UniProtKB/TrEMBL annotation, chain A:
Source superkingdom: Eukaryota
Keyword Transmembrane helix: yes
Positions of transmembrane segments: 26-44
Family matches, as PANTHER family: TRANSMEMBRANE PROTEIN
Keywords from the UniProt entry: Membrane, Transmembrane, Transmembrane helix
Source organism (scientific name): Arabidopsis thaliana (Mouse-ear cress)
Keyword Transmembrane tagged: yes
Recorded GO CC terms: mitochondrial membrane; respiratory chain complex I
The protein, known as: Transmembrane protein
One GO term of the biological process aspect: photorespiration
UniProtKB/TrEMBL annotation, chain D:
Source domain of life: Eukaryota
Annotated region (Disordered), positions in chain: 1-27
Residues shown, of full length: 30 to 57 of 114
Name of the protein in question: ESSS subunit of NADH:ubiquinone oxidoreductase (Complex I) protein
UniProtKB/TrEMBL annotation, chain I:
GO biological process terms on file: photorespiration
The protein's name: At2g31490
The UniProt record lists the keyword Cell membrane: no
UniProt keyword list: Membrane, Receptor, Transmembrane, Transmembrane helix
UniProt organism field: Arabidopsis thaliana (Mouse-ear cress)
Bilayer-spanning residue ranges: 33-51
Record lineage: Eukaryota, Viridiplantae, Streptophyta, Embryophyta, Tracheophyta
Source superkingdom: Eukaryota
Classification via PANTHER family: OS01G0750800 PROTEIN (PTHR35479:SF4), UNNAMED PRODUCT (PTHR35479)
Any GO CC annotation of this UniProt entry: mitochondrion
Length: 76, 109, 48, 28, 251, 168, 83, 74, 70, 247, 80, 51
């Protein structure tokens, strides 16, 4: 309104129209992709697939934990 | 005077009772063509007594009419969305005036 | 709308006879014609 | 038009932690 | 299966209603609507498709799960199975009634709206219509398309995620040992509910006098409009009780 | 890829919530919709892999609450039921984000709204993917919280505040 | 946008003109209903309800009972921001 | 929103916390009747004894009713 | 106009101060006797008897005598 | 208030853990129903009293009575879940109640009133304070992900294995604490401003934000990975639980 | 109607315990086809029809069996 | 739009009308096709393995 233009918030307050919002949006998208790379690596490392799939699947490209839990007697 | 004011206050009660009864007739009818007849019939109730002159009897009729409204009132009346009680009421209100925001509060000096 | 009150309210509602606000029950089953015609064409095709 | 015409806030509304900025060229 | 099916039609119905409300300047009362089928063709069609899929119209998405549940309840030869069969069967009629009542009051009756609302209407912008189209397609085809995978006789699709003990398996007997009539009661009740909705909301000019002249009919109208007085009773006897304890006893 | 499914809406909500002042309505609408839509695409791939491929996925990140026999963990379970719920949640959420882009276009506070939508999506994903009762409870409470936050989104309305408190 | 006084005047006078007892020749934006037009005050209540529907407003009952003239209704409707 | 009312009279003790046409105990009675409908339907289902008219014998699985496959002693 | 301090309302402050000084109002009335008898003696005793019985029911479920308490 | 709630309150539970339970195990056993009853009564009655309080500081102070009596239930359960949860909840309360007193103090330093009725609508003038206040409000409701949930649930686990009734009465706190915490937050932060009472506002300065940061970090850290704390405590807790018995 | 599928075959094919009935020797090919065809309903139609006919016959035999028992309940009643 | 005594009603967008007509036509055709394919089975006249 009138006083809200003097109020700082993280989400930007009412009717937020930053002038450089396109470049900022692009920078945010690059940041989310960079953050997603290590998450994807950790997920691929951590995934456990006890059963071979019926047909080839995309996770077989990066995940090497297919058919490893067969000897569950030795689990600890 | 006093008899004029006392009769005037009664008139206000009757005019407001009729307004509320008419608005509720629309809540129970929904379709326009049913409202026409229902409104005509309500107006005939008031018109039958329109010509009474005795003031105590007017008060008794007013009290009876209010009691009748309050019993046969529609449980879920229609409200314009931005009116009080409406679905849009107090959504995104304009900010109040007279609000000041202070800067540089609580400095060590 | 026989009484003066109902007559007044019916008079105010004249705009509700708007051509494309009324007789909407004829618009209730859209595509009922195209769908049935397409089904008939398919059925004839299935005969051969 | 909300996607092709840039916004109007040259600077954001408010000041972070309600401190006025230092004079131009100066440091807090 | 029914959860996945409901997520398509109910999301289509809420988003279609949101489109109507947006187009009508945030009017949400069906008593101030009507004659809107021609003004919002796409939204009306989306609401029709969602409603037909919800009531279990044959071969639409909601048809493949709802009637299978009703047939399975019929096949459960227990006290609670009988209870569920009866209640679900009558609820089918009730849901058909209210679905068609919504359609009729919103789009088909002579308009009961305000002129200022009609003169400012507009149909869905593209970021709104796209999800409506996708959900309409889902509500048409997802049921048929996923039926064998999820509930097809002997399917292994679930693997070990779900467990049914042998003693409780009734799907074969529901598809094979049920009288043919049992399978049609959902269509018959739905048809009856649609017909009753048409009569109540179009050819009834005085079935509302009762609620204004009879005390018993008025209280029943209130009973059902006010959710069986459940909130009233709970607040009056439970919430108020705890709130009063907090001040009058403990403090 | 399975972690990306769960955590992409969290990333989108975090950028809309912590940096919405730099993106505004348009940026926050895009950022949040993209992240949920990408999670939806990966969810479809997971449905192909797990349900159609008959290859369940198990992922254990770390212990959460370990006290003697009590063994609550940050662990994820992807079986047929899980991927079915994944498709439902991510697809409907992507569609609802897209719809909201235009439905809330005139609302003053759309970035906060989109952030709340994405945080709800993340908590629902945590709910359906948990491999133990405690992670499921975390998702249960998280969706309760997000529902409360969204019900009273118009915080000036007394009816909304009452409804949100009642729901909680 | 707001509605111009003129538009309010025209649509209020059209509402009043539709009343059956009222003769559509003596309805100015300053006529009084129980003095110039020969109407009972229940007719006034009906006309106020009709103005309410015509502009989509919800007038509080205290204020509705005060509107007794065309001018009174005209000023209420043009001063209302939601008309 | 518009103008919050500033009190001009002494507040009551229970003012921090302060369903219109039906009474309290009357609403309780109507709701009790509604739930008694469910009770009566349950008793009717008991009286029906649908379990005694099942039109098929119980299923019988092979291999001793799947004793080993259900975790029994091999 | 001037200041961040709240503009006091006399009735609100009267309400608050009345809340802070409730102990001066206690009268040993019939209602108060009943409320202290029910909620200050009886209910705690009932809860204690519940907790103890729970342990005794565990004791007899394990083929053990009743554990003595207090 | 921060020192009183965060440290001084912990001295009684520390005394129970440190001298009473291991020195007199037979008496500890004999009095266990008594302690359970007292604590359960405290949790229900004090939570309900909290619900009807009209002063910010009075609401936060009453909340601490319910939390500490849950701690006592945990420690007198005399198992790993119980004592571990009691210690974890002691530490978590020391962080959370201190942060809540700090929030109320931020409000009081500016406006000089503790009466809830004067406030309202503060989200529109103090969004940073509103967000931080909401976070610590969630922590005070034992929301999973926060530090207090770990101790609360571990104590309920410990109690359930000994006496299911006491666990059932203690789990009622989940409902009552939510009620008063959310009611407080919504009456302070949500709604509209009341300019006839307050019209001048200031959000948090740098010092206040910095003060809040370590509380947030600690709450989240204990909430998501309580293993760092529980690993250093298990041997001591185990020997406390076993003291007095030799089987 | 005698059991054809062995226990080993049913375990190797991973049949849900409630579908380990007399008709499982036909369920095995049907489920193989269903998995190979992405569970499309216009696919595997012969396998599915054969399996469903088997299941229908099982139900019919249990219906005739119950028809025989229920006509001896009456024998007891009219002889009492 | 068309204006009738004050009230003006705007004609809908052409693609909106077309999309609604076509999706409903598709729904009606799908119902008819499904009824023909598997309606005797639900009616109970025949069985899927009959032939
Ligand atoms: C045979 C009858 C049995 C009783 C004999 C006494 C006579 C009598 O009471 O009058 C007859 C009386 C009525 O007959 P009447 O026709 O009116 O004839 C009256 C006579 O002419 C007599 O009339 P009178 O006016 O000449 O005499 C009245 C008589 C009446 O006799 C009485 O005194 C009875 C009245 C006492 C009842 C008190 C009720 C409590 C109410 C207070 C409420 C406080 C709550 C506040 C909470 C907060 C509020 C918001 O009083 C006396 O003169 C007797 C003196 C006894 C004094 C007792 C206490 C002295 C202590 C010092 C004073 C107090 C200081 C506090 C310390 C307390 C002590 C530890 O009969 C009865 O009421 C029948 C009694 C039934 C009892 C049940 C059955 C008993 C038998 C059980 C056998 C099992 C084995
Ligand atoms: C058989 C099932 C038995 C078990 C269930 C019994 C419960 C049935 C409830 C019946 C009473 C419901 C509330 C009473 C209201 C009522 O029945 O009349 C309804 C209609 O309800 C029904 O028709 C029953 C639902 C369908 C069941 C057949 C009319 O509603 P109005 O709001 O007045 O609409 C009238 C339209 N107009 C004002 C424009 C004239
Ligand atoms: C871990 C990652 C979690 C990422 C979630 C993003 C959190 C969003 C930041 C808080 C939003 C905020 O800044 O407050 C807004 C408003 O403040 C609030 O509404 C207070 C409530 C904040 C709610 C934040 C909680 C998010 C829920 C996540 C819970 C975290 C999980 C708990 C377990 C660890 C600002 O106001 P506005 O821009 O909307 O404009 C309105 C202004 O007030 C007047 O016009
Ligand atoms: C199984 C028992 C366990 C122990 C419990 C305590 C002992 C048992 C109870 C003792 C009862 C004594 C007799 C009371 C009844 C007589 C009443 C006579 C009339 C009366 O009202 O007298 C009042 C005397 O109150 C009094 O003298 C007050 C009575 C004492 C109350 C005891 C409360 C115990 C603690 C409550 C629970 C606390 C913990 C809860 C978690 C004063 O009248 P007045 O005229 O002055 O009145 C103000 C008017 N202006
Ligand atoms: C202030 C806090 C006081 C708390 C009161 C403790 C409540 C329970 C009391 C237990 C009573 C009790 O066991 O009786 C005797 C204790 O000496 C006693 O009688 C207790 C002495 C303490 C003074 C009185 C406490 C309340 C007065 C204020 C020992 O008797 P026992 O050997 O039969 O015990 C049974 C062993 N199985
Ligand atoms: C379906 C795909 C989205 C299409 C949206 C286009 C909207 C349109 O036509 O614009 C006109 C549209 C309004 O024009 P009107 O509907 O013609 O009135 O403009 C907008 O407000 C939408 C344009 C930007 C918002 C939608 C795109 C941003 C979200 C992108 C998310 C991408 C997720 C997928 C990526 C991989 C995962
Ligand atoms: C257990 C005891 C329950 C009653 C307790 C209340 C006692 C009381 O004061 O009540 C008197 C109660 C009112 O008491 P008052 O407030 O003192 O007047 O009497 C009445 O006037 C209400 C009772 C008659 C009307 C309700 C009849 C039941 C209708 C149920 C219909 C349900 C249909 C659902 C759909 C089916 C399909
Ligand atoms: C669903 C709700 C139920 C329906 C409610 C039913 C209500 C009952 C209907 C009848 C109520 C009465 O008789 S109500 C009282 C009867 N009328 C009188 O007061 C005596 C007449 N005198 C006057 O003051 C005027 O003629 C007056 C007519 C007021 C015009 O006022 P104006 O001088 O300003 O034009």
């Amino acid at each position: 309104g009138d006083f809200r233009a003097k109020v700082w918030s993280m989400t930007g307050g009412p009717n937020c129209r930053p002038k450089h919002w396109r470049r900022n949006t692009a920078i945010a998208m690059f940041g989310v992709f960079l953050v997603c790379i290590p998450i994807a690596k950790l997920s691929a490392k951590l995934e456990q697939r006890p059963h071979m799939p019926v047909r080839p699947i995309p996770s077989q490209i990066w995940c090497k934990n297919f058919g490893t839990k067969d000897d569950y007697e030795k689990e600890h | 005077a006093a008899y004029f004011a006392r009769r005037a206050a009664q008139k206000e009660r009757v005019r407001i009772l009729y307004r509320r009864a008419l608005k509720d007739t629309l809540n129970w009818a929904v379709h326009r063509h049913i409202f026409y007849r229902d409104a005509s019939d309500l107006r005939e109730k008031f018109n039958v007594n329109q010509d009474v002159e005795d003031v105590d009897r007017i008060d008794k009729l007013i009290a009876h009419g209010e009691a009748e409204y309050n019993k046969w009132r529609h449980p879920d009346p229609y409200i314009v969305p931005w009116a009080p009680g409406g679905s849009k009421f107090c959504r995104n209100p304009t900010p109040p005036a007279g609000i000041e925001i202070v800067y540089n509060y609580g400095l060590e000096d | 709308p026989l009484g003066t009150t109902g007559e007044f309210f019916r008079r105010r509602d004249e705009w509700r006879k708007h051509p494309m606000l009324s007789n909407q029950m004829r618009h209730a089953l859209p595509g009922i014609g195209i769908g049935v015609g397409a089904f008939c064409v398919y059925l004839v095709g299935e005969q051969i | 038009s909300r996607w092709a015409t840039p916004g109007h806030e040259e600077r954001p509304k408010g000041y972070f932690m309600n401190r006025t900025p230092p004079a131009p060229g100066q440091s807090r | 299966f029914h959860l996945m099916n409901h997520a398509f039609f109910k999301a289509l119905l809420f988003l279609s209603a949101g489109s109507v409300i947006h187009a009508m300047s945030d009017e949400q009362d069906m008593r101030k609507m009507g004659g809107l089928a021609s003004s919002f063709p796409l939204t009306y069609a989306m609401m029709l498709i969602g409603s037909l899929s919800l009531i279990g119209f044959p071969f639409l998405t909601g048809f493949y799960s709802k009637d299978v549940i009703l047939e399975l309840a019929y096949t459960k030869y227990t006290i609670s199975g009988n209870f569920a069969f009866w209640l679900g069967s009558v609820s089918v009629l009730f849901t058909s009634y209210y679905s068609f009542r919504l359609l009729f009051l919103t789009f088909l009756v002579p308009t009961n709206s305000f002129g200022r609302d009609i003169s400012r209407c507009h149909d869905a912008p593209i970021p709104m219509a796209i999800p409506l189209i996708l959900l309409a397609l889902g509500s048409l085809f997802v049921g048929y398309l996923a039926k064998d995978m999820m509930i097809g006789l002997g399917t292994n699709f679930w693997a070990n995620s779900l467990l049914v003990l042998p003693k409780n398996e009734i799907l074969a007997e529901s598809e094979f040992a049920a009288p043919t009539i049992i399978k049609l009661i959902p269509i018959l009740f739905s048809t009856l509910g649609a017909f009753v909705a048409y009569n109540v909301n179009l050819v009834a000019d005085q079935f509302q006098r009762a609620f204004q002249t009879s005390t018993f009919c008025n209280r029943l109208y209130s009973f059902f409009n006010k959710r069986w007085f459940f909130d009233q009773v709970l607040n009056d006897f439970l919430v108020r009780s705890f709130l009063r304890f907090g001040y009058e006893v403990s403090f | 890829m399975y972690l990306l499914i769960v955590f992409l809406p969290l990333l989108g909500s975090s950028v809309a919530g912590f940096f919405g002042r730099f993106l505004g309505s348009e940026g926050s609408a895009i950022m949040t919709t993209t992240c949920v839509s990408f999670s939806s695409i990966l969810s479809l791939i997971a449905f192909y892999e797990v349900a159609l491929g008959a290859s369940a996925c198990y992922l254990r990140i770390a212990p959460w609450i370990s006290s003697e026999m009590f063994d609550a963990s940050w662990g994820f379970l992807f079986d047929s039921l899980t991927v079915v719920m994944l498709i439902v949640v991510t697809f409907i959420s992507s569609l609802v984000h897209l719809y909201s882009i235009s439905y809330m276009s005139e609302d003053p506070h759309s970035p906060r709204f989109m952030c709340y939508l994405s945080i709800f999506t993340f908590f629902m994903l945590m709910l359906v993917t948990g491999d133990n009762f405690l992670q499921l409870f975390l998702g249960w409470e998280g969706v309760g919280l997000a529902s409360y936050l969204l019900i009273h989104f118009w915080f000036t309305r007394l009816q909304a505040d009452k409804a949100a408190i009642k729901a909680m | 946008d707001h509605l111009s006084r003129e538009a309010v005047v025209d649509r209020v006078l059209d509402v009043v003109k539709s009343f059956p007892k009222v003769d559509p020749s003596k309805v100015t934006p300053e006529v009084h209903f129980q003095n110039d037009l020969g109407l009972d005050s229940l007719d006034t209540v009906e006309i106020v309800m009709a103005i309410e529907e015509e502009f989509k407003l919800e007038i509080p009952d205290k204020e509705a009972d005060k509107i007794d003239s065309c001018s009174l209704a005209i000023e209420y409707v043009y001063n209302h921001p939601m008309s | 929103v518009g103008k919050h009312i500033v009190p001009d009279k002494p507040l009551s003790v229970n003012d921090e916390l302060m369903a219109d046409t039906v009474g309290k105990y009357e609403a309780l009675a109507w709701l009790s009747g509604g739930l008694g409908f469910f009770v009566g339907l349950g008793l009717l289902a008991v009286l029906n004894d649908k379990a005694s008219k099942v039109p098929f014998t119980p299923r019988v699985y092979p291999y001793d009713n799947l004793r080993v496959e259900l975790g029994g002693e091999p | 106009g001037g200041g961040m301090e709240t503009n006091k309302n006399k009735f609100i402050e009267d309400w608050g101060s009345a809340r802070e000084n409730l102990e001066h109002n206690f009268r040993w009335t019939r209602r108060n006797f009943a409320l202290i008898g029910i909620f200050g003696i009886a209910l705690p005793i009932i809860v204690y008897k519940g907790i103890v019985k729970d342990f005794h029911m565990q004791d007899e479920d394990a083929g053990r005598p009743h554990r003595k308490f207090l | 208030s921060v020192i009183l709630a965060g440290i001084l309150l912990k001295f009684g539970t520390y005394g129970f853990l440190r001298f009473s339970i291991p020195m007199f195990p037979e008496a500890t056993l004999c009095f266990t129903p008594f302690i359970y009853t007292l604590s359960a009564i405290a949790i229900i009655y004090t939570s309900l009293t909290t619900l009807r309080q009209i002063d910010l500081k009075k609401i936060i102070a009453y909340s601490s009575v319910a939390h500490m009596n849950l701690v006592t239930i945990g420690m007198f359960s005399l198992n790993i879940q119980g004592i571990g949860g009691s210690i974890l909840l002691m530490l978590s309360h020391g962080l959370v109640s201190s942060a809540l007193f700090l929030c109320v103090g931020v409000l009081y330093d500016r406006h000089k009133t503790r009466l809830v009725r004067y406030y309202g609508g503060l989200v529109s003038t103090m969004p940073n304070f509103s967000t931080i206040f909401f976070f610590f409000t969630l922590a005070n409701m034992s929301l999973p992900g926060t530090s207090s949930f770990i101790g609360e649930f571990l104590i309920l686990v410990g109690a359930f294995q000994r006496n299911s009734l006491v666990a059932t009465l203690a789990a009622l706190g989940m409902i009552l604490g939510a009620a008063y915490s959310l009611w407080l937050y919504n009456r302070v932060v949500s709604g509209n401003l009341k300019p006839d009472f307050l019209h001048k506002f200031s959000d948090l300065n740098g010092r206040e934000v910095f003060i809040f940061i370590p509380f947030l970090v600690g709450l989240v850290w204990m909430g998501v990975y309580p293993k760092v704390f529980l690993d250093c405590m298990h041997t001591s807790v185990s020997n406390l639980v076993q003291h007095g018995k030799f089987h | 109607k005698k059991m054809i599928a062995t226990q080993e075959e049913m375990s190797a094919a991973k049949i849900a315990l409630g579908s380990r009935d007399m008709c499982a020797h036909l369920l095995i090919p049907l489920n193989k086809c269903r998995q190979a065809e992405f569970y499309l309903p216009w696919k595997c139609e012969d396998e599915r029809h054969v399996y469903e006919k088997c299941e229908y016959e099982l139900v019919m035999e249990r219906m005739l069996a119950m028809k025989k028992i229920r006509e001896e309940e009456a024998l007891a009643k009219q002889n009492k | 739009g068309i204006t009738y005594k004050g009230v003006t009603v705007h004609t809908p967008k052409t693609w909106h009308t077309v999309t609604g007509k076509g999706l409903c036509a598709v729904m009606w055709f799908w119902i008819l096709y499904r009824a023909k394919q598997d309606g005797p089975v639900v009616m109970g006249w025949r069985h899927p393995w009959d032939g």
